[PDB]
Amino acid sequence: MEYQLQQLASLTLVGIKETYENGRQAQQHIAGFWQRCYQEGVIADLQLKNNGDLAGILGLCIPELDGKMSYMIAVTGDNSADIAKYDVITLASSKYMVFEAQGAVPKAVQQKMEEVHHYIHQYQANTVKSAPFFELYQDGDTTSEKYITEIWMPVKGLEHHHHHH
Numbered sequence: 001m002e003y004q005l006q007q008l009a010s011l012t013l014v015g016i017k018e019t020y021e022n023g024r025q026a027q028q029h030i031a032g033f034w035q036r037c038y039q040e041g042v043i044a045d046l047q048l049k050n051n052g053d054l055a056g057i058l059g060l061c062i063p064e065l066d067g068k069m070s071y072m073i074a075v076t077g078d079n080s081a082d083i084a085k086y087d088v089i090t091l092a093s094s095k096y097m098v099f100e101a102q103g104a105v106p107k108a109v110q111q112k113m114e115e116v117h118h119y120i121h122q123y124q125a126n127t128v129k130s131a132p133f134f135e136l137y138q139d140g141d142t143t144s145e146k147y148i149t150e151i152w153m154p155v156k157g158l159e160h161h162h163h164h165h
């Protein structure tokens with residue numbers, strides 16, 4: 001599989017986090033979650049705050065300690081007072097395998113996620129199950145078959161993997 005290595009410093013994310021019973025239960029609600037954020041003007045409002053640390057809007061899957069799975073729609077931002085009643089997290093510094101899903105959203109992203117899922121099975125010691133992974137949506141027509149969604153999977157010690165020696 002094709003991917004790029006990237007590294008991020010610690011970042012401040014601003015948005016809204018919801019929590020679902022698990023990873024599968026989330027998949028049916030995450031679509032509705034996006035829809036509500038658009039409808040209520042949350043996406044438009046968050047886009048104003050995007051400081052461009054990451055270029056686009058994020059959908060982060062955050063694991064919870066009780067097995068639940070949260071999803072956060074967010075942008076990279078900063079200034080606290082204007083941050084207001086949004087949810088805020090610090091995304092801890094990490095290296096990433098960054099994959100590209102080209103095609104109309106969400107189908108292309110769903111299909112690429114399945115492929116990524118199968119691919120990283122072989123990197124058990126390098127993936128970070130406790131760290132958030134995310135989709136990054138740049139500006140563009142998400143219904144275009146040329147549209148690219150990025151999928152960021154955090155990793156540690158990947159240079160030690162025997163496949164790279």
Ligand SMILES: c1ccc([P+](c2ccccc2)(c2ccccc2)c2ccccc2)cc1
Nearest residue numbers: 063117120121127128129131132133153154
């Ligand atoms: C709990 C939460 C997330 C993952 P995973 C993963 C998939 C396959 C093999 C090992 C790990 C994942 C990846 C893509 C979609 C869904 C779940 C995962 C999480 C963070 C970083 C790397 C891998 C696993 C368990």
